[PDB]
C-alpha cells in the first residue's frame, strides 16, 4: 500500500512496524495468599517464634489496611523456615504488598494463578503466544489488594488479565522524517509520526495514550481518525503534494534510527565514523545514507556522535563463597 521508495526520497524512512491491539475488559482472578505456613499444632519448643512472625506480619499488613540445646534448635529450624516462607512469598507477591493498588504482577504470581500451567493460561484467557509476550513487556497484567485479614493472616489479590483484541489486519507504522537536500537546499517533510495501515485503509493514530511494545501497540480504545485525501496521496506515492518545509531558522532531525540501523543525511553535514575517522561511502543513488553496526559501531554526524551498538563481554555475578 505505502510506497516507501518514493517516501525514502523525501526523507521519510520506515520505522518499527507494529500491529494494533485494543484492550477490552480484563479477566480477574483472586489469589488468596495464606501468609501463615501450615505449622504443626504441637506446642513444645516453639515458644515465641510464632508471635515474632505474627508481629513481623503485622508490620507488613497494618499499612495495607491503614491505607535445651535441641529445644533452641527446633526453634531456630522453625524460625528460618518461616523466614524462607515469607521471603519466597515476598518475592512472588512482594510488589503487590508494597503498592496495594495497581501494581504489576510478578511472573511467578501469574504462574501461581494457574498453578504453573502456561498451557492452561493461554487457553482460558484466550491468549496467543504473542499477546502474552506483549502484555508481559508492557507490564499490563496488574494486581490489587482487596482484602486483608489481621486475625487469620491472609490477603486476596485481584490479578487483572487484560484481553488484547488484535485488529484483523492493521499495522501501526512509524514514519521518521529526515532532512534531505533538494535544489541545493535542505528540506524536511511533515507527516504524522505514527500511521495506521489496514489494507487500502490509512488512518491517523493518536498513539500517545497507548502502550508502545516491540511487537504491537496496546490501546485502551481505537484512536484511529480519518485521513485527508492529500496525506493519503503522499503515502500512496504521489509525494509531489506531500508537505515539506525549509530548515532555515529551525532545527530539524538529520538522522533517524530503525531496528538498529541509522538513516543519515550526509549532503547537509559531513558524516564520519569515530572508529576510523574517515568519511562514509556516499552515492547519489539515494537522497539519504544508511549506516549499520556492520560498518561502524559508532558514527559521528557533524558533531553528533551516535552509537550504532556494541556487545561488551559477559561478567560473572560476584559474591562471597559462603557455605
Amino acid at each position: 500500500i505505502l510506497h516507501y521508495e518514493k517516501l525514502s526520497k523525501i526523507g521519510l524512512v520506515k520505522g518499527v512496524t507494529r500491529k494494533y491491539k485494543i484492550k477490552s475488559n480484563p479477566l480477574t482472578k483472586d489469589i488468596v495468599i495464606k501468609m501463615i505456613p501450615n505449622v504443626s499444632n504441637m506446642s513444645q519448643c516453639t515458644g515465641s517464634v510464632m508471635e515474632n512472625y505474627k508481629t513481623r506480619l503485622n508490620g507488613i499488613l497494618t499499612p495495607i489496611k491503614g491505607a535445651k540445646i535441641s529445644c533452641k534448635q527446633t526453634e531456630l529450624s522453625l524460625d528460618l523456615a518461616l523466614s524462607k516462607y515469607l521471603s519466597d512469598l515476598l518475592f512472588v507477591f512482594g510488589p503487590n504488598l508494597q503498592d496495594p493498588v495497581s501494581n504489576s504482577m510478578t511472573i511467578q504470581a501469574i504462574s501461581q494463578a494457574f498453578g504453573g500451567n502456561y498451557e492452561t493460561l493461554l487457553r482460558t484467557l484466550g491468549y496467543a503466544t504473542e499477546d502474552f509476550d506483549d502484555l508481559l513487556e508492557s507490564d499490563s497484567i496488574t494486581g490489587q489488594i482487596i482484602y486483608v485479614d489481621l486475625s487469620s493472616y491472609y490477603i486476596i489479590v485481584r490479578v487483572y488479565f487484560p484481553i488484547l483484541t488484535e485488529i484483523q489486519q492493521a499495522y501501526i507504522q512509524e514514519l521518521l522524517p529526515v532532512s534531505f537536500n533538494n535544489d541545493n537546499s535542505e528540506w524536511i517533510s511533515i507527516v504524522p509520526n505514527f500511521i495506521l495501515v489496514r489494507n487500502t485503509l490509512i488512518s491517523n493514530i493518536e498513539i500517545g495514550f497507548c502502550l508502545i511494545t516491540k511487537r504491537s501497540v496496546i490501546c485502551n480504545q481505537d484512536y484511529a481518525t480519518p485521513m485527508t485525501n492529500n496525506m493519503r496521496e503522499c503515502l500512496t506515492g504521489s509525494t509531489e503534494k506531500c508537505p515539506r518545509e525549509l530548515v532555515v531558522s529551525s532545527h530539524v532531525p538529520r538522522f533517524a534510527l530503525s531496528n538498529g540501523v541509522l538513516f543519515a543525511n550526509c549532503i547537509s553535514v559531513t558524516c564520519q565514523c569515530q572508529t576510523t575517522g574517515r568519511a562514509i561511502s556516499q552515492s547519489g543513488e539515494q537522497t539519504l545514507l544508511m549506516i549499520d553496526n556492520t560498518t561502524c559501531p559508532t558514527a559521528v554526524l557533524g558533531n553528533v556522535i551516535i552509537s550504532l551498538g556494541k556487545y561488551l563481554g559477559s561478567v560473572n555475578y560476584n559474591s562471597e563463597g559462603i557455605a
Epitope: 564520519q272 572508529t275 576510523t276 574517515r278 561511502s281 560498518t295
Partner: antibody
Amino acid sequence: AVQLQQSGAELMRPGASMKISCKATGYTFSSYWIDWVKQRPGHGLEWIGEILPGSGDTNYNENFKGKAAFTADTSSNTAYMQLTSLTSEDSAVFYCARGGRYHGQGFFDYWGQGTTLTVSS
Amino acid sequence: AIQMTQSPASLSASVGETVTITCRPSENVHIYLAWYQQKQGKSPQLLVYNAKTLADGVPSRFSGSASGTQFSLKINSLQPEDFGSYYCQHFWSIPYTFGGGTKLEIK
C-alpha cells in the same frame, strides 16, 4: 598511481628531527589518504598515521602522536611527515601508501619505493 | 587497539604445491582485511584488499576466504616468484594493525 617516490636516505644524530617526503602522480591527489607505515628491518610492519591532502584531516597512532607530524603540499603533489625525538629505535624504513577515499578503504593500493631513515651517533 | 594473529610465522611449500596462509584479528573487523606481498628490497604489494576480492593485476593463483574471525589466503600452483613476506592488515579501527608476517620458502 604511477609514482610514489620518496626522498633518499639521510643521516641524522639521535635527538634530532627529520622530514620525509613522498611524490604522488597519476590521479586526483586531494581525494585519497596518504598513510605512512613503518617497517623496522627485523620485526615486521607497523602503521603510523594518515593525512588527507584535500582537507588537511589527519589521524595518528598512540605510539606515534608526538613522534609524527604530517603535511600535504597539494600544490606540488608532495606528501610529508615530520619525525621528532629520533633515537636508534627510530632508524627504520618509512613507506607512503595510497589509502582509499572513504571508510572501509584502508587497504594500500600503491606503496613507496623505500628509503631508510638512519639514526646513529 | 585491535591485535592481529597470523600463523604460521614461516611456511614451506614446493613448486606446484597448494599453500594457504591464515590470520585472525582480535575483534570482528568485517570484510575489512587486506593481504600484501613483500620481498627483500621491495615494498609490499596489494593482493587481496577486501576479505575475498583480488586487487588489480594480481594473478588468479591467489585467492582468499572470510569467516567470522578466520581469514585465510590460498595460493594454487605455487611458482618460484611467490616467495617473500605476506602481511595481513585490518582497517576496522584506529590504529590499523598489521599481522606478524609469513615468510614463504620455495622448495
